[PDB]
Amino acid sequence: QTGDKKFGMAIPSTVMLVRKKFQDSFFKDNKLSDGVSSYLTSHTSSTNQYVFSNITKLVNACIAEKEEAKKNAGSSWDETKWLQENPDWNKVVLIPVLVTYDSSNTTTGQANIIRIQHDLKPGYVRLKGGSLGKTNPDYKLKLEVISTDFGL
Amino acid sequence: CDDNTGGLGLGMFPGNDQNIKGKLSTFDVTTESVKTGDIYAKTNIGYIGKFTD
Amino acid sequence: KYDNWRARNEAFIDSLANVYATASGRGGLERIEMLTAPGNYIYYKEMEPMTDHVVKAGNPKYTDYVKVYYKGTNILGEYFDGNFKGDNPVVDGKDPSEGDSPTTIFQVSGVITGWGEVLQRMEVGDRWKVYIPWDYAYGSSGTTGILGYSALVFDITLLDFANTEAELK
Amino acid sequence: KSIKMWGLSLGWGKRLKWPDDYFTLSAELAYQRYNLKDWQYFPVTNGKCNDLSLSLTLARNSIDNPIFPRTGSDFSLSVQLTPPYSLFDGKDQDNMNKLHRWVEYHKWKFKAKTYTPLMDYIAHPKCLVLMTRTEFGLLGHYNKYKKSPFGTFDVGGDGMTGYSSYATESIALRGYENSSLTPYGKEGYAYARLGIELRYPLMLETSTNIYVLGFLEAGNAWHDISKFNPFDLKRSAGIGVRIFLPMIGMMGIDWGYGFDKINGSKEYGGSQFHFILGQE
Amino acid sequence: QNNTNSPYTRYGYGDLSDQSFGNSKAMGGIAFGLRDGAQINPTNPASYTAIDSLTFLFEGGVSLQNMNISGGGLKLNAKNASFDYLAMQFRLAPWMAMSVGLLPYSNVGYTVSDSQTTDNGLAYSRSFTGDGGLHQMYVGAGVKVLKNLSVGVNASYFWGDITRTRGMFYPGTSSYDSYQRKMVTSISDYKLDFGAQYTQALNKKSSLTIGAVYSPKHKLNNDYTSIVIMGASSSSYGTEYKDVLDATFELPNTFGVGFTYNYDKRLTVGADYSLQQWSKTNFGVVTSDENVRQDFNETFTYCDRTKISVGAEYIPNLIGRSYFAHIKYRLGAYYTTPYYKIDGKKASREYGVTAGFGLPVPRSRSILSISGQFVRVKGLETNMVNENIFRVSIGLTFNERWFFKR
Amino acid sequence: DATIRAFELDTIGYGVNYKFTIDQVSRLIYNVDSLPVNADTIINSILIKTLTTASGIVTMKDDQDSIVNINDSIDLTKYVNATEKNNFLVLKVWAPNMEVQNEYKV
Amino acid sequence: YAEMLEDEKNAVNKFIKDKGIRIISQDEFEKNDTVTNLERNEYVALSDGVYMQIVDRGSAENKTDTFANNNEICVRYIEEDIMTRDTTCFNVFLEEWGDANQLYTNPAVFRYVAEGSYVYGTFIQMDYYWASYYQSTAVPAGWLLALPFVRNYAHVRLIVPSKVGHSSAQQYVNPYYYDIWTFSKALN
């Protein structure tokens, strides 16, 4: 944060990552976090990071969607056409959210989430990477995947 | 009472057991700023005031 | 891997101690007398001074506060704790996989004796790499993440020091 | 909030003449009732349960001295049925406090001990003896789903601690905490316990009797009867002493070192102490 | 991990345990032709008819071991302990005897681990374990059809469970899912074993016996299953994607033959030979997944096992007043080609030398049978391990006057 | 054989404590926030506390080296604003082996 | 007592016979279209022993905005104890307590969860009286059985046995009667 201002705007404490297909439907239907289509994480002030740490279910969901589309189309499939349409198949958005918990089951503590909603108090943060990463590889994020290779 | 045998044994196990490996690979993700749109707020708090940044 | 930890850590300290006494150019090392045990020395290496000093001449005191970038590592170079994880602190960092480092506040009397001795002789904006014996580190059993009887090596950047936190934070 | 248990039994024994005249047959009939509400250490939580059981036991006993035997053996083979209501005789948490108005099982046991002297005896009658144990048990079920929640086995430690409850059978396994191999949700439906012992008496008298021993135990228990495996056991070892009092039973001290782990954890192994009272 | 730590046990049913009781374990395992009436012998059912009239024999046994394991310049050792037999035997008629007992058939035990680091900086660790075995509980009888000749059978329940796992773990990583596949094979069927013995009265004081034993080829009821676990941890069970398969398991035809010479009841010598037709067994599984199929076909594959053994025991001047005249002295040695096939070629070849005693209890007919055995397993190809294994063996034949009547 | 320090002083106003900086390189002690004008009547007889060091033997020059009365009250009005007409409260602290020697001026 | 407390059915039968109340089976309730007649004081025998009467099925002109999963529902009610015939809990206006402004100014609001099994609900906002008296956030399970049979702004009357009551009714084994003046979809 800039300026060392006394009463300035703070970094959003909790953010949600959701597939762009559900960008507005998620909040209009009052859904809770899906696990296979959206994730919640807190800011890690000791490193200045938002980290999601395992988004495997979302990747499998996207792969299954495209494979099912290819299976239904059969011999008349065209990969370029199907990526030229449905341009938000593989896009996700990061949203500041306000998350509230229930208070009961207190001694055997669990703290279930009961409402996720848009964060409307003033706050901001400046993230690394940007639109110049579309052309220049210095300004582009990396996604890290680890797997088991059976050698077949 | 020992429970380890160490690592002696691999090399005689069948191929589909001793060929399994782990791996790390990385892929590139682009990000950009986008406008908010017409969000559905629906909160019970009412906000009143002004400030300059 | 971690066999006979104490002897090899002490041997590392002795290697630095006699290198300063026999090598050309002191092997790059410099040293300070330790006020909690006169006659003992802490060994350190001078590094690239900063370019955004808050122009605070003088050296920190024993009972006042300090703002730093720091990283702590053991003899094999492995990570222990700190504000940064690469080979330099990160500010306006170009690489989008690493964030800009936070700054942390400490009290000179509230840290291990090695820090408490070396911080009283830096001037704002110095960068030093310091080599502290296990006698003046946490020592003996050690904290979480320390295998006991460990000689830590720290990389310190002094940004600012003050009498209270509220005029520093 | 409490748990209520009461019952009674009647039995009838008879000496045989077929193999030899040491064999004794025994038959017994028993009744028990369990009474509960909002209780939690049993799978059953709310209701009342009954059981009628008929037991046949065939035993042979040929030892010389009850308190410090020196020759002979003690064999027992027992089977304990309760009528099979799941079959046509009776025909027709999710529904587990249901269907156990009457509980169903058939329990089998084998139990053998074997005492030999190692230095002549008769002469210098203080002597020195080698003992030997071998116990097996099965709690079978007529129907795969209507397995009995009562009468299961509980194993690990002194064994005496289990008689704070009377709906289970407690089995000592020396060198492993107490009730360690059978925690909540893993009640024992089959078990095995083996083990040598070498014993030397310090004093044998009318009022008090003393002896010291070193052992070599090995035991285990399974939540599933189909995975019974008497060659996969939690081994042990140790030493101990026992006291017989003029106006009280046994009291004794046993130390044991558990060698193998339990359920992947070494927390229950290592050095352990057991404090035996009454009689095993 | 209660009988073995040899990593050869990742193949087949493990390694077959020899159900050799106290006298045979010191005498190299020459159990086919033996008629030593003071101790039990389940390996040939025709041997039961030698028991004295009023006696009941109850035998048991332990064993400790120290395996020196070597390969590729690495050296290590590992120490376990076992339970090898328990059996009862008694007489039903002047011409028939019966026995019931509990025996091992084969065991598995191995943990073999690993730790690594990729060039990209990721550290990872693997872990291949195994546990379980096959067991046998039997009831058998032997009868005299002629004054020289005895025959007998063992009918056995035959059950077990062998479990074998593969893991992939990433120490130091904050949050991740571990991969582990646990292939299990439960078995529950029956096994039949047949034998005969004949004794000849040479030279009025000696005697020579010959024995043979046979068990037919068999196909086993089983419950083979292919579990893959995902995401298990120190706090969570993960998820299990089970998979049930139509696998076929078998036991081969087995043949054995041997003899024992005996003199003045002071000396016995003998030798045995046996062959098991493992290479003529049709193991297999049917599935749509090639990885599983290849594993099955590479882990359950065999070669013909053969065994050659020789041994003796000597009991000097058993009526003189000195305890060392009452002690049975035993010796033996044996050779085996194990049934392991690794790659296309045969895996190992093993040798053994054995010695032991026969300590009797005074004023009783119980026997304590302390015995010891050195065995060396040599790998026949450069990538495989060599073993030097040592083992004591305690066992007690209780024996008491049981069926007496006035 | 160290000379670690935590030198402190008690409430001057009710619930008001003043912080002292400890310059071990230059061997002197002072409070950054100056005492109020009212205090010259209060520190006339006042109590020192938390003077913790590796071995508590400490003395002040008087001819003699008399031992400190750490548990007793003291007149500090002679030692105020000691930078000019310099009149520090100068005191000597001993190491536990009595080999290492130090003085501090307050 | 342990099993003797389950005699709540005697008290419910007393509470039924003390008033004009008729019982209809669900298989008749769902076949005369769907209505409990108010001139005859009909009640349906629902699942888990709940007796329920719809006084107004609600939203009669729109007919489409029924309740469903992830909704937040506002409840106004008055609660009567069956064993001793006493008004125990409420958040509605009545002249006998008209000047007690704290009790009735704010409603109770709960989230409604309706996945493939085990319907349940959690209070987001408890009313002042419930929040001080019972201090628990779990909705009486008997209420949730009524939602599939009504629409927005419905008026229903329920008798709730102990097995599906709130955290006090489940311990002291006490049935209750609720006059739910309104179920509403939550605005703002």
Residue numbers in the entry:
A (entry chain G): 386 to 537
B (entry chain G): 18 to 70
C (entry chain I): 28 to 196
D (entry chain A): 590 to 681, 697 to 884
E (entry chain F): 23 to 428
F (entry chain H): 34 to 95, 98 to 141
G (entry chain J): 27 to 214
What text does the study give?
The β-barrel assembly machinery (BAM) complex is a conserved, multiprotein machine that mediates the folding and membrane insertion of newly synthesized β-barrel outer membrane (OM) proteins. Cryogenic electron microscopy (cryo-EM) structures of the BAM complexes from the gut commensal B. thetaiotaomicron and the oral pathogen Porphyromonas gingivalis are similar and reveal a 7-protein, ~325-kDa complex with most of its mass on the extracellular side. Remarkably, besides BamA and BamD subunits, Bacteroidetal BAM contains a 14-stranded integral OMP that is intimately associated with BamA. The remaining four components, named BamH–K, are all SLPs and form an extracellular dome-like structure over BamA that may provide additional functionality to enable the folding and assembly of the many β-barrel–SLP complexes that are a hallmark of the Bacteroidota.
To obtain more information on the relationship of the co-purified proteins with BtBamA, we collected single-particle cryo-EM data on a sample in DDM purified from ~10 l of B. thetaiotaomicron grown in rich medium. Maps to ~3.3 Å resolution were obtained that allowed confident manual docking of AF2 models and subsequent refinement. All the abundant (that is, visible as a clear band in sodium dodecyl sulfate-polyacrylamide gel electrophoresis (SDS-PAGE) after size exclusion chromatography) co-purified proteins except Bt0502 are present in the cryo-EM volumes, each with one copy to generate a large complex of ~325 kDa, which we term BtBAM. In striking difference to the BAM from Pseudomonadota, most of the BtBAM complex is extracellular owing to the four newly discovered SLPs. Further classification and refinement revealed the presence of two particle classes in the dataset. Class 1 lacks density for the periplasmic components but has good density for all extracellular proteins, whereas class 2 has modest resolution for BamA POTRA domains 4 and 5 and for part of BamD, but with poorly resolved extracellular areas. Given that models derived from buildable areas in both maps are very similar with only small (maximum ~1 Å for Cα atoms) rigid body movements of the extracellular domain, we present only one, the ‘hybrid’ structural model. The highly conserved N-terminus of BamH is wedged between two strands of the BamG barrel and interacts with the conserved BamG N-terminus, and the tri-acylated BamH lipid anchor is positioned at the BamAG interface. Together, BamG–K form a striking, half dome-shaped structure in the extracellular space, with its apex almost exactly above the lateral opening of BamA. A total of 17 glycosylation sites were observed in the cryo-EM density.
